[PDB]
Amino acid sequence: GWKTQDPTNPKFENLAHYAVSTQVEGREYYDTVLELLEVQTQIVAGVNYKLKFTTTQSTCKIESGVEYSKELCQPKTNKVEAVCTSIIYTVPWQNIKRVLSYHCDAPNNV
């Protein structure tokens, strides 16, 4: 069902930033996205995006009450710290976006 899409499309990069913004458990800092590696899509009820991207610790402390954004939450260092896959469910005609899954592994080539 999954159709490959162009991972340089900024619409897909912004969905990856949305996904990282939802991940707070066990952290002091938000992660942020370094690179979107892969995007696949499927239409089931809504429009679903399966994103694979690298992350690293951002400079944004979660408990400061800061809103996550790509601009503010820059990487502390340019080092890959995780490779993550996240599925996002959307209903474009209702402006709904929901992270269904988010899982990461450590980079095996650092």
Residue numbers in the entry: 13 to 122
Quote the original article.
Here we characterize a novel cystatin-type protease inhibitor, mialostatin, from the I. ricinus midgut. Cystatins are tight binding, reversible inhibitors of legumain and papain-like cysteine proteases. Recombinant mialostatin inhibited a number of I. ricinus digestive cysteine cathepsins, with the greatest potency observed against cathepsin L isoforms, with which it co-localized in midgut digestive cells. Mialostatin localized to both digestive cells and the gut lumen, where it targets cathepsin L isoforms and regulates their activity during trafficking and processing of host blood proteins.
